[model samples]
Target: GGRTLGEQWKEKLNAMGKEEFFSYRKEAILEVDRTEARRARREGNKVGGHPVSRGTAKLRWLVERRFVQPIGKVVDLGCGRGGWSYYAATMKNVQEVRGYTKGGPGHEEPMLMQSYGWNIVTMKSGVDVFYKPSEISDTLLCDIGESSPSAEIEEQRTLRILEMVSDWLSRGPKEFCIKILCPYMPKVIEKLESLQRRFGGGLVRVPLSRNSNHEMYWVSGASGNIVHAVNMTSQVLIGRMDKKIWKGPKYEEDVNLGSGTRAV
Candidate 1:
């Protein structure tokens, strides 16, 4: 046959400029966000998104809260189909969004090629190689997914990922929004806290919908003082980190107050 469905969509998006493309779908995306938020509440889950749906709506939430900016260079490590990558470039009006996938270019690559082709750069390589200390700035998005189910092995992988992103985390003007499985959240927070001590930064956990088993954490270098908070009525929680403790939503009593407990 001729071009695949993905190819056809690619052409369609190419014709639509950054603003035009996202503007057209703005209403649909808003609905997705509202729906997912409600679903999260009914399920009593703390995380959202999976390999399939990919949480474009949650991505919108991050952008709206200013956790992820629309203007700045971004690196999406372990990018799957480039969902968030494309959203950042087209919807968020980011200057550039570079995506790194270990496997290869995915279904969305072709569409990205046409629509935000120049704006999105994809690299096929190991996480270490794709992460450039000098090149990373503004924001770094990471999603390692459930690399392994074994607790020990999972911890190892989490540490490895932390090491890979450590350079960027140590540097200035750096912000990170990473997705982690619920089981691995504590260790991840510990490592991030250590980095904060060395690099002068802080991190906070964002409450996700109850339907999700994975949680999203936002970390930033001390230079920027990035933080998040959430409303009691809302499923997502936003809080900030001072030089002291990590603050969270008021509705929940168990807060990660410094050394007492790790925020989920």
Candidate 2:
């Protein structure tokens, strides 16, 4: 066949130069590398070139909304490359930014962590046992990739992971943001709604504008102070008026920071 899709895109981005490419195509580069790494592993080979940029808008939105505070602890679960950990440290002035990943930091990520003053840990197991209740308080950034286990088992594992994090949040965390794939979103939403009912707090599903399916569920007010939070619904849920869709009534102030480029 012709050059692989990645090669085609690589050639395309090479012509875009630094400013436009870094701002717009950086995440795409990282994603292509991620895909190629998996392909390489399946072929009994290893790949390199893990991107060194924190290119997603989620970090900016979190900062603009104040969910990430100046003087709080942060734990980034499934923290690939620890990019958010670095962003949290450099921008938020968080006391500590700890990241947990199954594999150790990537090639440049360790240096990125040091440059940004963050920490990373490699865990053979899941995030549930990696952190203690006291260790998590102000903010937690969790983003786990979709599992490749059997479909039945994958669904079960996703639910279990969500429940585990919900329990931890129930104990007490000022703010949290977790992301999951769109395939199992119905189940994730149900679990989140249950958590909202059991614990007095606000939860909103903010879909990533780039990909509506891959969404982020944000939970706040778990500590009962009614902290400043950003409440929003995914564009996918707009106009579909179902009372049970969201756990509670809509709060007054909401922003759809949809893939909008704000200065990071």
Candidate 3:
């Protein structure tokens, strides 16, 4: 078969591990690596590159409009590497943030935890991905997108994620948040609404930029601490829409940062 992209990258990383690849070009390598790592972590199980999901100018303006206060633990449902978790952790309002996914830290889960200052959790069993001891908080958030759709598949997958999240809420976390990008929006909403109705109304809708094919999120409590939040749909929200967009953490050179050697 023709050389795959990953194959080529593996070849380069294995062959010119340093000198030719990472030596003086350390900054670019590290930057690319970390950013890519973040992207992979947030995406959970999608296999593709990101290409600036376009949205409206209104999406940018609604980034900070919130009714409920920040929550205790913000959970990233398909946190591959933990990029979203890292971002959520920094919010002064959020106490502890956690992420769950199939893939662990590209560098080191613990190390990444230390660097980003967040907690680590994983799905345990069957493709079994979940965070144990659901986070009980005044608020909570989830950002699980659509890797695929079947309703049955999506429901099973979504429920698994919800079960894990519910575990957290069961403990004490009051409010819950969910950000989903599902083409089957109406159906997904119907299922969630049924649950919320039976469980009670702690859920609210937020307006997110309704980009052509883009979908954002909004979530709140399902029970007790009755509250709900919306993402504001009138406009689109950018990934890095904060005033001080994450320029990324400070990086330094690491001569011994590779697992292989340079082919001279």
User: How do the residues 7-26 of candidate 2 rate in per-residue lDDT, one tens digit apiece?
Assistant: 22333434555554334422
lDDT of 1 at 164: 69
The runs of at least 3 residues in candidate 2 whose Cα sits more than 4 Å from the true structure, single-residue gaps closed, are 1-56, 67-70, 104-114, 118-134, 147-157, 183-186, 198-212, 221-264
> Which of the numbered candidates is closest to the native, going by highest lDDT?
1
Backbone clashes, candidate 2? 0
Clashing pairs in 2: none
Which of the two, 1 or 2, has more lDDT? 1
lDDT for model 1 comes to 0.45
Worst 10 residues of 1 by lDDT: 254-263
What's each prediction's TM-score? 0.51, 0.50, 0.43
User: Candidate 2: minimum summed lDDT over ten consecutive residues — where?
Assistant: 253-262
After superposing candidate 3, which stretches have Cα over 4 Å from the reference? 1-63, 73-75, 104-128, 131-135, 149-152, 183-187, 198-216, 221-264
Candidate achieving the largest TM-score: 1
Per-residue lDDT of model 1, residues 112-175, tens digit only: 2222323354544544433445355577777665533344455566677677667655554455
Arrange candidates by TM-score, descending: 1, 2, 3
